[PDB]
Amino acid sequence: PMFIVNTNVPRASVPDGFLSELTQQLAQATGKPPQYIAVHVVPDQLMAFGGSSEPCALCSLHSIGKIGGAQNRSYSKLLCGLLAERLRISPDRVYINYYDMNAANVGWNNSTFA
Amino acid sequence: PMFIVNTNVPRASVPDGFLSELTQQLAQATGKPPQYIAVHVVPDQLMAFGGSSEPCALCSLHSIGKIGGAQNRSYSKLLCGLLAERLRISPDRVYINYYDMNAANVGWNNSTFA
Amino acid sequence: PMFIVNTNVPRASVPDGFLSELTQQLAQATGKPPQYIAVHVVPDQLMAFGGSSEPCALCSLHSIGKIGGAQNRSYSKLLCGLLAERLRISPDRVYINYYDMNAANVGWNNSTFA
Ligand SMILES: *C(=S)NCCc1ccccc1
Ligand SMILES: *C(=S)NCCc1ccccc1
Ligand SMILES: *C(=S)NCCc1ccccc1
Ligand SMILES: [Cl-]
Ligand SMILES: [Cl-]
Ligand SMILES: [Cl-]
Ligand SMILES: [Cl-]
Ligand SMILES: [Cl-]
Ligand SMILES: [Cl-]
Ligand SMILES: [Cl-]
Ligand SMILES: [Cl-]
Ligand SMILES: [Cl-]
Ligand code: NA
Ligand code: NA
Ligand code: NA
After folding, report:
1. What residues contact residue C95 under an 8 Å CB cut-off, 6+ apart?
2. Which domains, ranges and CATH numbers included, belong to chain A?
3. Which residues are catalytic (chains A, B, C)?
């Protein structure tokens, strides 16, 4: 999978090893090889949640399979947990959009996964 | 819903109260509680529309329901109107991708909306 | 269509005219007037691919139609080729999410394409 997090939290508050932790945790959560996992963190964003600019985050998780009711609940617990612990963002100020991608709609290495 | 606007307009040109206005207007437009609305503005982007670097914007609106033919036309009029008035972006240089998300695919507060 | 590229490569490494090149190349690849094509490049991002922060990119291509198995493979060869040549990013460190949008879900000029 690939995970993206956009947040108003400042870059200086993103701890060393954050991308690495996300990569490993997502590998364990989806059972996928970490070598194909991509993570992207975007701090210092101009955003609001409920009209308030206290710390918040807007994220997305794309995956070819491994997306579903129970799985997404598990991913949300894991990811909100990491955002609260590492970036001090309250879980109720985090949204995560989940996308189950068809292999044919994911390009990589001059081709697709189809 | 959550609304994201990516634009080449510089940060200094984003007026005070913009995020607040988007939050209130989207709440009114969708009938959703403002406490749930998330807004994200990304200025100073390197982008082109029709090959031209004049002011433009690429946006997205995700919502669990309240997405449809007539509704999307109304949101586009509302949002393009705000971008034109506040950021001075011509409506024909704005694209807005609409997504009707399944509740199970939207994470929040350690779980999902399902 | 609209093409977005998020990458960790330096802004200084993005060639002048890259946005125009992407615009013209995509116009040819889709047989669409360049006037409709939007391109967005985001450099200097904090990201990792396979746990490594060597050059990589996360992209998306949204189009109303013209999305499919064979077409996406073609777009991937074209886009990875440009990223490798212009941004020096290895094709195997690039992901491109393809989206076939319904006209009703694409806002533009105060309305939608429906
Ligand atoms: C996790 S193994 N990501 C690798 C495949 C993928 C899935 C969705 C989007 C991009 C790449
Ligand atoms: C508007 S009420 N947003 C709150 C629920 C939501 C819907 C789609 C994506 C993220 C969050
Ligand atoms: C290519 S012709 N872009 C113009 C229509 C479009 C399609 C998808 C998303 C935004 C705009
Ligand atoms: Cl599941
Ligand atoms: Cl469950
Ligand atoms: Cl898909
Ligand atoms: Cl409708
Ligand atoms: Cl209508
Ligand atoms: Cl969905
Ligand atoms: Cl329920
Ligand atoms: Cl095809
Ligand atoms: Cl769609
Ligand atoms: Na899907
Ligand atoms: Na949908
Ligand atoms: Na689609």
Report:
1. A2, A38, A106, A107, A108, C49, C57, C58, C59
2. 1-114 (3.30.429.10)
3. 1
